[PDB]
Amino acid sequence: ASPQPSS
Amino acid sequence: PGKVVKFSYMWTINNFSFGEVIKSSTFSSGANDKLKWCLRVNPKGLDEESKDYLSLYLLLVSCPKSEVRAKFKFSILNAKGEETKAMESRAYRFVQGKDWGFKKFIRRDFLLDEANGLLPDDKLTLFCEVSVVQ
């Protein structure tokens, strides 16, 4: 549920 | 020069129900509008893990130096104008061309249920608030 990059 | 250090961006996607991406218009902050941002949405998910979700990311399109550190919050504005279904980031380190966000931001079946009031007139309105700390 933490932010992550899309790539 | 002065700097826009906090900003809130509101984006309405029409006819929503209609790994592929929709990108928002570019919006500016910082000194002399030199930080450039956009939202990226995957309406049908980033991948297999997130097939059932809309994915939502904040992308640093342009910046003058190496990096920007920023905190951010995404939410949906409902048929009444109220913020709902918020998710928020600490500050994250962005570099130009890189993004941060939520691959499982909201379930598609919830969003598409008219009972929830999240797609009035089949429009999705997203709201992104950003605070740039470096």
Author numbering:
A (entry chain B): 3 to 9
B (entry chain A): 26 to 43, 49 to 119, 121 to 165
What does the paper say about this structure?
SPOP is composed of three domains: the meprin and tumor necrosis factor receptor-associated factor homology (MATH) substrate-interaction domain and two dimerization domains, bric à brac, tramtrack, broad complex and bric à brac, tramtrack, broad complex and C-terminal Kelch.
The 1.7 Å resolution cocrystal structure of Pdx1–SBM2 bound to SPOP–MATH reported here places the Pdx1 peptide in the canonical substrate-binding site and is consistent with NMR titration data. Pdx1–SBM2 also deviates from the consensus SB motif sequence, containing a Pro at site 3 instead of a Ser. As is required for other characterized SPOP substrates, Pdx1–SBM2 harbors a small aliphatic residue in consensus position 1 (P269). The other two side chain contacts involve S268, which is N-terminal to the consensus motif and similar to extended interactions between SPOP and Pdx1–SBM1 outside the consensus motif. In Pdx1–SBM2, a proline resides in position 3, but the peptide is stabilized by H-bonding by the serine residues in positions 4 and 5. In the SBM2 complex, the distinctive internal Pro is flanked by four of the five backbone contacts, three of which are unique to SBM2.
